[PDB]
Write a protein that binds this ligand. Structure first.
Ligand code: STE
Length: 219
């Protein structure tokens, strides 16, 4: 890999912009949740703050490669998923909010990060390794929220999955050419994303049958 090439920098402008927009939305979304759930505001504001630290880290990765992120691209990339989060929050549908942010986006991001790490330039490797470690180690508020409420929210989780998992797949397909330039295998992202999502859904309380049904809805 030539990290300094026009080709790599062009792809990175879009991939980096996507990660930054994802982190910007995560920060905003955890602040929305903190406003709606004042008893939980300290934990949610700490998650927001962590997202902002990760944003700064990925910004430094772009600066290191002299890449300007393609922000209009990334805003459009996230528009549909972001809209579903904001509409859910508007309806007080915290179940969907948690599924989108704490399960779907979280597993998708960690999958992508894990596929990027072995092919990342050394600076970005170090930064991304710390981001992943942070995600593994810190409180996943939304996962715990859902787990604690499993019997009452399970149908809503299934609805949120059916609405939003297909959007994941479209997003992944949309950047296939750019992930290829970065030497990230799309299929590795798919596999990592699904194994993590199944582990998280199982922790919440879902069975094998249940997770298989949710995967079929993503199709
Ligand atoms: C500097 C760039 C790091 C690149 C890593 C590979 C990225 C490939 C695209 C995958 C997009 C998913 C990003 C969503 C980010 C937000 C996740 C979160 O808030 O936990």
């Amino acid at each position: 890999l030539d990290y300094r090439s026009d080709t790599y920098r062009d792809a990175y402008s879009r991939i980096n912009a996507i990660v930054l927009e994802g982190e910007r939305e995560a920060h905003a979304n955890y602040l929305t949740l903190a406003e709606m759930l004042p008893d939980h505001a300290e934990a949610l504001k700490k998650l927001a703050a962590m997202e902002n630290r990760h944003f700064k880290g990925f910004q430094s990765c772009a600066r290191n490669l002299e890449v300007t992120p393609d922000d209009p691209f990334a805003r459009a990339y996230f528009e549909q998923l972001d809209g579903n989060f904001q509409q859910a929050a508007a309806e007080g549908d915290l179940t969907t909010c948690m599924v989108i942010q704490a399960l779907i986006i979280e597993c998708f991001a960690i999958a992508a990060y894990n596929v990027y790490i072995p092919v990342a330039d050394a600076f970005a490797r170090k930064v991304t390794e710390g981001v992943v470690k942070d995600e593994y180690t810190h409180l996943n508020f939304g996962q715990q929220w859902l787990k604690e409420r499993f019997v009452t929210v399970r149908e809503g989780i299934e609805r949120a999955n059916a609405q939003n998992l297909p959007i994941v797949w479209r997003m992944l397909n949309a950047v296939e050419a750019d992930t290829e330039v970065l030497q990230m295998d799309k299929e590795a992202i798919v596999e990592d994303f699904m194994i993590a999502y199944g582990e998280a859904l199982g922790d919440i309380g879902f069975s094998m049958r249940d997770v298989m049904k949710m995967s079929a809805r993503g199709l």
